Amino acid sequence: NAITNHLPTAELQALDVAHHMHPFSTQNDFNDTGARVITQAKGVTLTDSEGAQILDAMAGLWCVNIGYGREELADVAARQMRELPYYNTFFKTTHVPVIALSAKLAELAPGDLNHVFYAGSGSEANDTNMRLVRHYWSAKGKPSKTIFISRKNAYHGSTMAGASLGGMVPMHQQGSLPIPDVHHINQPNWWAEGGDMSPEEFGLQRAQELEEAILELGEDRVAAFIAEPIQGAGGVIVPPETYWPEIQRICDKYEILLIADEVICGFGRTGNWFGSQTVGIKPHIMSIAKGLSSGYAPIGGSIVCDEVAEVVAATEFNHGYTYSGHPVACAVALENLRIIEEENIIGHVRDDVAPYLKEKWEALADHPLVGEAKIVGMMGSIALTPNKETRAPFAADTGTVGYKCREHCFGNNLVMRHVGDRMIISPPLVMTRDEVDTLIERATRALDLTFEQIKAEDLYKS
Amino acid sequence: NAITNHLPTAELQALDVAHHMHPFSTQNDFNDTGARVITQAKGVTLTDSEGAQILDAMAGLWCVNIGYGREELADVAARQMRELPYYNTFFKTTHVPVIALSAKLAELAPGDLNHVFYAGSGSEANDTNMRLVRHYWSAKGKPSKTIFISRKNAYHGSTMAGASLGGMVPMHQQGSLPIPDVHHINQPNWWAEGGDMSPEEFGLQRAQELEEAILELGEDRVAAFIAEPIQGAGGVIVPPETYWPEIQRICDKYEILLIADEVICGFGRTGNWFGSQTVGIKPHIMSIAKGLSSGYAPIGGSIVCDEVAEVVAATEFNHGYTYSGHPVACAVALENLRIIEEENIIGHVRDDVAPYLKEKWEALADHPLVGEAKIVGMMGSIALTPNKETRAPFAADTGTVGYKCREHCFGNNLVMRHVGDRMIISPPLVMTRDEVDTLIERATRALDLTFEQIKAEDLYKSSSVDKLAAAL
């Protein structure tokens, strides 16, 4: 039997759990609940192997920025695969797709971020960052500058390096992690960690932790601060207005590289080409992936400022991947950016859908179960809480209420994910206002069903 | 901002060096000589932006196994990209391409290798292996088993972990590497490191370093031994006949996982589906990429054995990449595997081209510059030497002669690379006998030119200490 969309879902699910190990999963869970089989997608809508139509408020995995079914990219890939499906960039060799895409990326990246080292993923781009930066500081005559400073509940990939830069304890527990010279300061999540400080003062305190970490560890030991402009996988944590201005102040004062992990935030997600632009900072390096190709072809990379590139360009840089700059991926990514740029999809975000989504998403704070509704551009979160006044957590294991809401969302044909007891959305940037209404309608029904179930099941308390 | 094939080569090269940071390079010597722009390819032939045609004896980067120009992979990618160009396998969700690819890999991987964890590259596959294997020994109640044992001059990728697991000193010197709990033993390269030992004695000694390492580190600390069946990037080092059987028997003595890095050797390269079949080992995990999709789309992974997958299957495995199982990459890899299987390309290697290429390649040992010619399946190397009898290296820094030979190759429209003073080839598996003939004629002319050049440069010499040792 050939394995196609024509096989019964149950049969496909058996083959799935028998041979395909899923990311971030307990694989045995698939014996009880088989994996949902997505077979097609168009616009913002997915269809599963039973014909159900799900609104994908997560855009695949924060990445399908131009939405599904844009055929220009499939035409661009086929044409590239026919002419030159692959050649390497190792042999003093190059091709037009990576040349074109590198010039395009330099143009879009603000300031002197004008050079791209290519990777397959956001994880591999942050491996590049670790190796590039340490080599950079040695080449500058300061090889003791090795420490990357990150944050608890940051997420920077799933390689050995990526997982170590992220701040997920569960990830650190697997692989003898973190790798040496990776440190973590606290995250600017006011709702859960703010105490009774104002958001504004809490944002200052959390930013100041970078200067204290520098002084504690020694400036001669610190290589870089790496951070998501807005934490994505941590639960769409929007920092207070005070946070990034004080980070920038600290980075301006001390000899440290600022690494904006733009893997989720890049390419329109926050209303600008880069989250760095939105929050007002000036990184020396940006990690990119995901929205770079709207997820249609695997590709990521590091955009690097002139000064770092110049110093390393005088050295043999012994790093890189067989698929670095893969011509087809580059051709797909370039068409993605043309479609975002020339159809003004970022304008569509800034002026049309994001203001509408904001008004609707922030009104969910009116729901009894929702203590706060945070959103920038097209990434948003809601904290579910048993007490809005105390901002308290539920008594149950953090994520029990989130999981119930998540299940109610999917059962109501909407892709909204939980991180603990926050729910998160990251819909395609081409989403229209009428589509926002459906999202809000289904999110509200799922939130009501979670409320009643929690009440009935005795889980509404702190 | 319109950059296309129509632009002059000189202009394209200026944009390249200005914005494109090349892997494994000194970016600045692109200011000296700009990059060769490859514009198209078909079969085994590259064309560059000036119309020059190059026989690609390296198959892109050890990966274009079905050769260039297979428009089926484009049709499959396009059709997958219109139907479902991306979905994630993170949300208790899946899709048909990753399901079918996994079932095909489980059927092709011998024995109980029946489970695939997907990556984007061979490097990410090895990051998976480190996190998976350490987590597995911890799940088994033995958390102290963390040390990956690897080899010098091994190559296992370029992530923090891939670079660490490889054995390239220049790679260790960038990133504060190797990361902890990685140990390196010596490599089975008899030509350069054999001393006065016979090859098969040397083979046993080199494999015995694995037990020596295990015993000096402690069985309670060791988690895995990882190794390429045949070292590729280190210069296609074919171990002596004794080497892999002893490794295997050492691994069967100890609680240790054998990981075969099949990123190069996999999918026909050595005359079998996997280099482990050819060298006769039973790995617990195989790392895959390159030939998996014939490089037409980026994808990698780890093929995992039943007992390791099942141990982990009972735990939340907090690992994975957005593009793990990417539906277009899978569809392409599947079609690649279909073509390899249904057109019997491995049979074409085994019975037609590999024996012909072996005959002709090993005859290169008759060349006055060549000291040895080693080939398994469709990967080969030759050692360039000033003295065949002693195997003594050139007096000039290692790679001086290899580099000169590489240049004569590219001047003869042949992609033959050097690793130190070895030349290496890894041609597309669908290479025909007439294409072998062109390869060898070009390779032989490049050997001839190299030979008379270094002779004129006064570089055809071992060290004066090695020349005196010619006193027999």
Ligand SMILES: *Cc1c(COP(=O)(O)O)cnc(C)c1O
């Ligand atoms: C998704 C994520 C990554 C991981 O990139 P992969 O392609 O999954 O390896 C890295 N950084 C950030 C900020 C991410 O959100």
Ligand SMILES: *Cc1c(COP(=O)(O)O)cnc(C)c1O
């Ligand atoms: C090429 C190589 C790798 C790395 O694969 P990438 O796709 O470049 O990350 C790993 N192992 C071996 C043996 C390799 O040759």
Ligand SMILES: [Cl-]
């Ligand atoms: Cl929270």
Ligand SMILES: [Cl-]
């Ligand atoms: Cl040698």
